[PDB]
Amino acid sequence: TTISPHDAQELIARGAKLIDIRDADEYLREHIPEADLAPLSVLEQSGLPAKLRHEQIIFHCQAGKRTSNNADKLAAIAAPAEIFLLEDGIDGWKKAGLPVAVN
């Protein structure tokens, strides 16, 4: 299930985790302040750590392609949470006028 940036904001205000699945270099260049970084490759190897588990988990990437194409992996990695993919990724978040942190 996709979630709009504004709807994601409301879930994050209720404790939902926003997980950036990009690499550290991409995150360091520009990221969402509320996000926790966990690159997809790391999640595929060692799973979601306990500190990033919650009743609601929202994954995001750059523009919605990496979440869309790895939907099955992500659904397992965060199970049994209620899981969302941020619509159009950080690009969508920016287009909605929500804050990012730029290096």
- Residue 83 CA to its chain's centroid (Å): 10
Domain limits, the chain: 1-103
Pairing of strands 82-86, 2-3: parallel
The verdict on whether 61 is a catalytic residue reads yes
Give the experimental resolution in Å.
1.7
CA distance 75 to 63: 19
Class of domain 1-103: alpha beta
What is the phi-psi region of residue 88: left when phi exceeds 0, alpha when psi lies from -120 to 50, beta otherwise? left
H or E, element range at 37: strand 36-37
Catalytic entry in 3, 61, 77, 85: 61
The first and second tokens of residue 63, run together, are: 């523009």
> Chain-centre distance of CA 102, in angstroms?
17
Method used experimentally: X-ray
